[PDB]
Design a protein around this ligand. Structure first.
Ligand SMILES: NS(=O)(=O)c1ccc(CCN(Cc2ccc3ccccc3c2)C(=O)CN(CCC(=O)O)CCc2ccccc2)cc1
Ligand SMILES: [Zn+2]
Length: 257
């Protein structure tokens, strides 16, 4: 099965998922001097006040926090998007060292990690139908750098001990994802894909320019998770990121000058 090792990592994924070599794959390098300011882009609307978190889970390739998406509770609108996108889950990608771990890069710079808030377009009724559409999902991507702690992340960090290995989950109610957002909503946007199998080309990417800072102790807790299930040889869950893919016939748009 697919993963991030030498024999099953991103350079192998195209064999099971040939769209891996497609025309709108993610992530990409964001060349800040070539991205064009688009004054027709609207402010992003992030409406998370009624978010209802449900569970936190180790799925063998990351950890994710899932939300109730059976009603318009936590939604993303505006920016480049048409219509209403409901928050389904968030998860992270991170490195073995602070100089790598993000999926998107900025002028080839890699951050220590990247947060993905995954939303689906309610005009398609369910996420499984949305993944089959070119505008079915919107992922809000936020870079993490190591410095000061992020207080809004600590409740996540403190439960990771309870989901060390693949398959483990725990109750994770009343978590407020607004605590993970930087001050500015300035962003870059481009049409792309899921960055893990099935690599479906269904994502409007919205990548915030401002990173959040997390502490060394917080990221070290990410690096203590395991890719393996309980009972198997321990392989630390680190470097669970796909590298930048060819931009091909796409333009990256900036919301800001
Ligand atoms: N990094 S990212 O770009 O933000 C990024 C963001 C989001 C994803 C989603 C990947 N995904 C779907 C999938 C689809 C096909 C696959 C085929 C082979 C291998 C894996 C696959 C994964 C899942 O996690 C599993 N579904 C969760 C819901 C959903 O589909 O979202 C379960 C489908 C299911 C099954 C039973 C009950 C409920 C739901 C990837 C990358
Ligand atoms: Zn992701």
């Amino acid at each position: 099965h697919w993963g991030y090792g030498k024999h099953n990592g991103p350079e192998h994924w195209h064999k099971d998922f040939p769209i891996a070599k497609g025309e709108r794959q993610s992530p990409v390098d964001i060349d800040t001097h070539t991205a064009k300011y688009d004054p027709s882009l609207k402010p992003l609307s992030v409406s998370y006040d009624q978010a209802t978190s449900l569970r936190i889970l180790n799925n063998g390739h990351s950890f994710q926090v899932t939300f109730d998406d059976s009603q318009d509770k936590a939604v993303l609108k505006g920016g480049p998007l048409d219509g209403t996108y409901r928050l389904l889950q968030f998860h992270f990608h991170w490195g073995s060292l602070d100089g790598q771990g993000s999926e998107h890069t900025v002028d080839k710079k890699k951050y220590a990690a990247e947060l993905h808030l995954v939303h689906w377009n309610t005009k398609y009724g369910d996420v499984g139908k949305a993944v089959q559409q070119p505008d079915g999902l919107a992922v809000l991507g936020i870079f993490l750098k190591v410095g000061s702690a992020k207080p809004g992340l600590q409740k996540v960090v403190d439960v990771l001990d309870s989901i060390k290995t693949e398959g483990k989950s725990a109750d994770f109610t009343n978590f407020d994802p607004r605590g993970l957002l930087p001050e500015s909503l300035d962003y870059w946007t481009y049409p792309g894909s899921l960055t893990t199998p099935p690599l479906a080309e269904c994502v409007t990417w919205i990548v915030l320019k401002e990173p959040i800072s997390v502490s060394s102790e917080q990221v070290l807790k990410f690096r203590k998770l395991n890719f393996n299930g309980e009972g198997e040889p321990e392989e630390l869950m680190v470097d669970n990121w796909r590298p930048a893919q060819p931009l091909k016939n796409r333009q990256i748009k900036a919301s800001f000058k």
